[PDB]
Design a protein around this ligand. Structure first.
Ligand SMILES: Nc1ncnc2c1ncn2[C@@H]1O[C@H](COP(=O)(O)OP(=O)(O)O)[C@@H](O)[C@H]1O
Ligand SMILES: Nc1ncnc2c1ncn2[C@@H]1O[C@H](COP(=O)(O)OP(=O)(O)O)[C@@H](O)[C@H]1O
Lengths: 406, 409
């Protein structure tokens, strides 16, 4: 069960009455968690493998070290004795997380959830066997011959993914997929849209854990990287209810406190569970504009894990979290590498009404690195989507030793 | 004149391409400017007279010292060479601000504005002689003899105010000696107004590189003993009064000049509007914009964008460039009734269960009686519902310090 209880009080950061969170992973999602913590006077310690990471800049103190090293993490935890340990990435020493928890430290949402989400087979079997939710048809392959059999049985086109990816359209792609050993082979779902349901487990006034559901977030990606997201996804009411049902079955199995990014595919009224991250997810950055102040996915996660309540509205057996206005995001990604990134095109980009940008503060860029986002809002979610894309495309980037790129 | 120009580029904090702001005063208003700066990858250095002030906690670096000491401030400015020096309070060495500007550092909105606004006579004369806007009738007194004649000439009840940094509500001649005790004084006629409003006019560059002024909806509020207690947007005033508020604010900010947001204070009675005073920087009543304006557009973000030379989108209406509100909202302060270190707040299960509201706790390490430690924020389609809700949420919170018992409000 959950180690903490419903919270009625907060002290003040930098004094002996402070509450304290420890962010393991200091990227842009951790930065927004740190800003909400600062806005509540909660002390923030940010940890990552490099210095001046986004969340470290906003945090009260930081630690830099190899987050796969259990002894480094224990040293930080023993020094800081945080009220919540918030892992922001899967590349963290898993044994360490279980040991913190066994020793009484609150690991968010629990250590087991991160461990499960770490392994594709473990995760898929949990969804099928424990949560009992619908997923793409699939089979596993341990050898090249098994891969041929799987793709043929599943049917082309199919997706192959290492359990820890390739899109095989025909047998000619089998050799490539095998080179990308265990692999999961999945049937291709020709969905209308992919959605992330940001279900949050948190205490109600009785001290029991309730699950609250924001509107589904639609998104699209260039395989591996989300490129744009928006809220609400334009899906039917039946699909929406089914999205909540499936998310609830999954978060009931994972347990603990915190927000989850439950990923699903939607086609008409049909919904398939794809996977789930037991923490805030990048597509949810849209909630920085679509949810009211103090209620983005980062503030919801923070409130949940400190044991604070979160208001919601019960609708047909589901406790929903009302959206403020439709919104959308579009990533600003580096096409070059190097130190001291710079961004231009702001006169045009920042003159667009109902939109703005957030630049993450990363000190170095690498090709494909997300450096910021454009955010836009409108009564019409499609107008917000086009607008965020437009603003992001007006921005060009350069580093110390590179030329400008669009 | 403004020494920077329209900005099309931003670098990254902590690296050599960084832009950098220097906050002189690190209270709750500076903390929110620091948060928007961090959100844009802008480097923040926060200064104040005590350590771990609200903005210092969010800033990249901080300096602690007597901000009335010109040498201290120069040492910081020479070390940091910021793109903008942002005074958050009036109690800053004024000669220092003029010297920074003379040496090519950008003081917001300009040094003269802070020097004018901190002196009731320089300010009032600026409003009457240069901006040419309506104000309460007034007279100045430098002696008790002049004070008696002034109060008699203005008529009772009248307001007496010390020219710098001690006011009194004179109901009759018998109060005159008490007022002299609180030396220059301004004596004003009493204005019977319906509500006081803060117009958050912001001067900034437009896409063409010229300076324009944009107007958010007026913010209503109520001042209890020199301290605001609650504010809300939009103020419930007539459309005629609203346009007069914009007209008066424009005349005032065109005279003060520079770049940045201004908190122009006015009294409203029906369609009639009187200019009261003006703060040349973000103002506490404007915290309502943390909820009533869209993300990245509270008064703090409007100020930051303006002083970095970035554009701010607006909507032209009847000759005025307006800034659209997202949803009506209100705030109510959370003030300490006791003093001491390590404040703590309780009542959160009930207070944070109220829908469409939340709280911001400033992080101040010590409380003193009357110190503002946080605010409740609430929004609703109906501004009166938001006003009542912010008040209810604030009243659900009790506070204590390391060496005090729990106290309501
Ligand atoms: N079975 C599938 N059918 C259709 N599209 C899929 C399928 N599996 C993955 N994808 C697509 O590949 C990307 C998601 O990959 P996924 O395995 O869910 O995440 P990761 O690869 O980041 O673990 C998205 O474009 C998703 O739509
Ligand atoms: N001339 C006036 N008529 C009526 N009320 C006034 C007048 N001047 C001040 N007040 C009241 O006193 C409050 C404080 O005003 P003022 O002294 O000018 O600002 P500060 O509180 O910054 O000195 C005003 O907000 C208003 O409530």
């Amino acid at each position: 069960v959950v180690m903490i209880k419903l919270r009625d009080e907060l002290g003040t950061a930098t004094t002996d009455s402070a509450q304290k969170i420890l962010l393991l992973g200091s990227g842009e999602l951790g930065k927004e968690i740190a800003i909400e913590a600062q806005r509540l006077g909660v002390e923030v310690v940010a940890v990552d493998r490099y210095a001046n990471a986004p969340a470290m800049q906003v945090a009260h103190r930081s630690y830099v070290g190899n987050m796969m090293d259990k002894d480094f993490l224990w040293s930080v935890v023993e020094r800081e004795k945080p009220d919540a340990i918030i892992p922001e990435i899967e590349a963290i020493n898993l044994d360490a997380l279980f040991e913190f928890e066994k020793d009484g430290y609150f690991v968010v949402p629990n250590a087991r959830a991160t461990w499960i989400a770490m392994h594709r087979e473990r995760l898929r079997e949990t969804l099928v066997k424990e949560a009992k939710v619908p997923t793409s048809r699939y089979m596993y392959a341990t050898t090249l011959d098994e891969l041929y059999e799987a793709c043929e049985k599943i049917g082309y086109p199919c997706h192959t993914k290492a359990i820890m990816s390739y899109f095989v359209k025909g047998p000619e792609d089998i050799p490539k997929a095998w080179e990308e050993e265990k692999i999961i082979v999945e049937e291709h779902i020709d969905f209308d849209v992919e959605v992330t349901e940001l279900a949050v487990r948190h205490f109600d006034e009785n001290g029991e854990i309730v699950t609250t559901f924001p509107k589904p977030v639609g998104h699209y990606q260039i395989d591996g990287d989300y490129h744009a997201s928006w809220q609400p996804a334009e899906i039917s009411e039946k699909a929406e209810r089914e999205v909540y049902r499936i998310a609830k079955r999954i978060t009931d199995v994972l347990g603990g406190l915190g927000i989850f990014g439950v990923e699903m595919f939607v086609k008409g009224d049909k919904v398939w569970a794809n996977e789930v991250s037991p923490r805030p997810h990048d597509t949810g950055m849209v909630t920085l504009a679509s949810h009211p102040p103090g209620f983005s996915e980062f503030a919801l996660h923070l409130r949940a894990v400190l044991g604070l309540p979160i208001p919601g509205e019960w609708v047909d057996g589901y406790r929903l979290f009302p959206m403020l206005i439709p919104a959308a995001t579009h990533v600003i990604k580096a096409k070059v590498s190097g130190y001291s990134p710079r961004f231009r095109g702001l006169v045009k980009a920042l003159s667009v009404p109902n939109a703005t940008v957030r630049l993450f503060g990363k000190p170095e860029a690498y090709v494909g690195r997300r450096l910021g986002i454009a955010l836009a809002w409108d009564k019409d979610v499609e107008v917000a989507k086009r607008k965020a894309e437009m603003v992001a495309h007006m921005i060009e980037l350069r580093t110390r030793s590179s030329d400008w790129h669009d």
